[model samples]
Target: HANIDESKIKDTVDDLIQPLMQKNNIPGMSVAVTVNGKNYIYNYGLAAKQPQQPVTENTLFEVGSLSKTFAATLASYAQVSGKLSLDQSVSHYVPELRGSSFDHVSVLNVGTHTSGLQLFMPEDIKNTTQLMAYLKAWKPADAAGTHRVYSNIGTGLLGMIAAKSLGVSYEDAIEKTLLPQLGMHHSYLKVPADQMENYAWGYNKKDEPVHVNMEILGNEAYGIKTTSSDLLRYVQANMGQLKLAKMQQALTATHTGYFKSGEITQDLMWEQLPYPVSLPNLLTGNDMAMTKSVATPIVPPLPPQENVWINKTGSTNGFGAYIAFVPAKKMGIVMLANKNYSIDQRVTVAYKILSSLE
Candidate 1:
């Protein structure tokens, strides 16, 4: 319905959606889709999973690692502002990078998950000095970028580098300089002093979700608080509605596909469409459940197509989020959930939401 009229379709989708959340006992959910530049949003259930609270587009939700997409956007902005380069080494901005094998890695590798860091932050590094020390001690798993292994440590450092470039804390770079300049006012890399009431407490994996505390990943990998209302603005801007000619070229470059990697539509955080438009590509007759591989993404690209869907899936210990945009379609989607599902299944949810459009 994306290329077609999807008005009645949403109500139709929600008819099934609301009860599903309730039956499944999901606390609250906010869903939004942009079709041909029109935004359609639906809020259901509660913002909190337990001892619940009502949710609205204005209700804050932890976007998990999807926050990276925003962090990366600003890092790109820094590049556009002539502050950094995709291929530059970390040592240039953070001299603390000097001690490790990080000198052998490039910024591009970090953003792309080509850097050889652990899936989670290493225990050895707790503070900034230790963070650099961890990097100094790291050695690549494979040749850099040879095989992609997801690492929070890898993407988290991207935000650190971006902050170093701005001469402020990572939280300040995103909260003050980056998001505000981009017009994402409702978003915060660090929650604001007055905004606590808007935020929903995150849940652990158990049936009963838990309460209050802060998330600590300082960069592109984590550290964002947002509402679907404000997130919709990001969808709007990227799809070409609000002209950001005022910012810098780095922003543009982030959206631009940089590396082909294998084919199958691989980019750092986005996916290239693997099929042609006007023709359907479905697996078991379902596009949402369709996948190219088990772990490593299928590469060398798929047959050429008119549209490309580039997206990223995010998750933290207590939350999950997915954001995707299609360049050729001039439309995109944002989905955030306060549940911790497996990586593949979590990806399927946003994917199915988008697939419903087809």
Candidate 2:
């Protein structure tokens, strides 16, 4: 079993973490790590400063775009089950979008954010019909499969399409099928009534609560609420510890990096790069340059490559979260916070912790 010397790591971690939290004005955070077959969870500060409640392993925090990994996994399962195909046009699943640019967008392209779609749709496109109309009228900045733009709409559509193909409501599909498969009983698209109290309250820099607004396709794109413990279990499954053949297969399928721009690589919704990936390149991959709307011409995909450190970042208005794992080393880290912190802080903390485990 992979075991972390918990007490020693805790001591080493505390020295850096406390000061970082203070400097960043983070209200609370939950961190989970796995070394070999062992897992350790650490909680700090208060989940809610006003109520004065401490963070615990059970406390739920909004995971924002980190939820896209689940969405992509569900899509992968849909593909495995013959309910959908990533190579096919996304319009194949949502017929209402048939006449639009989506007809040229493959499901995989959308998941990988290379569909030539914008980072987000206008807020006025509130429902499916309106969204369809908007897409129909819009001209893509680049031909589908030619460029990469970080796209919430594109991935969200993947989830919605997966649900449509699976013959279930988005919530039901995730709550009933996905979570159970991963042994994530406590994770939820909508935190159940009983778990509500355990849900951490997220705050802005000013200490004001910044609740996640439920929007069109929200559940599929950025609406997961889960604990560090559950996220770590998902990492375990991605690491091939889960025994389900289909899920393990789907997990592997999801990691196949089919696209690269500069030093950045992408596999479904997970952003990745080579081991010891440069901080500059990592930041570029995570920054608006990678996602901000621009018409970068599409180029042929480079040969498939491996990114030893697979990672993603998520955040609501107030809350922020990040996860990274190295399958080769059988190690991973999960961090969730009630305050929106910079990705630099996140990547730094994750790097430090992942390095300590070695």
Candidate 3:
């Protein structure tokens, strides 16, 4: 149904966004909506408070953990290239953790947060040597693939393994091969000096300046900085509207549900729900405990039913981001804000718009 009331939608969208930003004191927001075979982008507020750069479709924001999806994409590509396998043991590429708890962990385990690892890197670890030592000696509470822990280190390890499998640095491989091939010309693991002006400054809850801190393989886990426009293009590719065989294969591989994490099913980095989804289950899927929840083995790949949603949330201290799409509806939404707001609110805002289209 491409017969959309554009004027009415624009007005309703404006009504929904204005007060949220006002109440949150958010510096800026860039949103992209795809529905009825049309794409629309809306930008509001300032990118920088002092310099007064207004948000635009091109304004870049740190996508935080949402970058996990890209890392999963890279790993998926590695599988396509025969450089890596989802079922392959992680220690194959990074032998440093060979004797440790990663022995049974597969590439997919890490991608789905079922690798029995902690949520973040250890605070005491300082460098690669220490990080390696930490991993080499660590013992996990539960066996790999038996528990779901929203692990930065687990996803970070996937990025490291992906880069090694490609026989190149992560930054180089992504910039030269993955992203460019995806037609995301403006996205970056490292934003170039020239494009720095388009990058938005993020704010913490206190409205103080904040940004993502770099850690080893941080780029793989949470270091993506990109525009809503570029991200929608990424989403379009996932929706199969933008065709590239290898990319499509990788994207499909990433979406195969491997484990059940609480109320939602776990794809690579995206979470999934059977459609006509309940608000309670949606809230359950969005809850903080969902990340820390234990995993249940999925005997068969989770079926992708019609009207199901595939989504991910990203956040740093100062920035927040989310992307959600319903494959059946051929509809999606991407939201970026320069302030760390509630993920529940992000889900609600997105669900309202998404449900209305049905």
Candidate 4:
């Protein structure tokens, strides 16, 4: 219930985060938690070290691959609006890939990372024409739906196709339509000039301040910069704790589990585990090995379940972000840091805090 003391939450968050920041040499962080119907935000350290800017509710952190979830949401929304179908072949939306490996791949496979696509586009692909050429000449190592290879290209194409199906650019569909509809005005695929000051400088492994350099499909895959407040709202909506008139159905659709890999269930862009999950299982599910492993198709995918821990971890060279929520408990969290730290540590800290609440 909402009766849990705020002071207790503050203490729990501070105790865990203070040491995490110090241990990782994190320059700044923003932690947002939702318990029952209450939402809390706690900011720490400096958003920028030189000419120091302290972290605040408005500070924007690049969410990296977390942007994939947003792309999935848009694709699902297109499905809900009857503009796209997940079961359709990719060739239907992007005619450019009509005779390519993607012709045999379903849109759902792309969203769930079961399309047998590689993690990143080749370094030589510098533009859309080159990207299309690569896809046209590429061959799959395994049939779509039979294997899972975490891929930015897969979700990137999903976003492009989804937006194209809706007669808009991917950035426009997300920035101009979706975010506003979800009440996430502060989130951006491209942070505007006016909002640039709110964007935090991400610190790389070498401790140099930098920001994400948007690649060809970056906007669709790993280019969103948002605040903890906006991300918590996004997580709340995923848990059905916050409702958007046109988005609730789409949000629920994105959670449908289409594949099983070890301990993790693959949802559209998000991964899930059965509730009451241990930290070890969570870590194993998110391990780099899992990303490189194969996943069995659910064959007529599993419907979304409330009794599960749904999550996604994201990183750019300079930023690290993790989001998790348990719909059954009406609880969620968003952890945003300027420094790209270990995903295992993020999962452990979140599990510790969430388990204590339980």
Top-lDDT structure, candidate number: 4
Candidate 1 lDDT over residue span 72-154, tens digit each: 77677777677778777766655776756777777876776666566777655567667666666778756665655556777
For every model shown, what is its TM-score relative to the native structure? 0.82, 0.93, 0.95, 0.97
Worst 10 residues of 3 by lDDT: 1-10
Residue-level lDDT for 342 in candidate 3: 89
How well is each residue in 1-358 modelled by candidate 4, as lDDT tens digits?
3665788888899999999999899999999999868999999999999888999888999999999999999999999999999999998788888878888999998898888889987888999889988889888888888877889999898899899999999989999899998899899988899988889999998999999888898898998999999999898888787657558999998989989988899999989999989788999898852356768888788898899999999999999999999988989999999999999999999998887675
Error of 2 at 268 (Å): 0.6
The best candidate by TM-score is: 4
* Ten-residue stretch with the least lDDT total in model 4: 288-297
> For candidate 2, lDDT tens digit of each residue in 275-306?
76566666666674345333232245333234
What C-alpha lDDT do the candidate models reach, one value each?
0.63, 0.82, 0.83, 0.90
Error of 1 at 211 (Å): 5.3
Best-first order by lDDT: 4, 3, 2, 1
**What number of backbone clashes does candidate 4 have, counting pairs of residues 3 or more apart or in separate chains?**
0
Candidate 3 clashes between residue pairs 3 or more apart in a chain or in different chains: none
What lDDT does candidate 1 reach at residue 161? 80
Total backbone clashes of model 1?
13
The segments of candidate 3 whose C-alpha lies over 4 angstroms from its true place after superposition are 1-4, 289-291, 303-306
lDDT of 3 by residue, 1-358 (tens): 2565776666656777788799888889988888877788889899888777999767999999889998888888998889898887878777877876777888888888888778888888878899888888877777788888888888888888888899988888789988999989889988899899899999987887766888777888889999998999888888888764787888767777888877888988788887877777887797743356778877677654446888899999999898999888888899999998988888888888777765
Relative to the unseen true structure, what is the C-alpha lDDT of residue 328 in candidate 3, on a scale of 0 to 100? 84
Ranking by TM-score: 4, 3, 2, 1
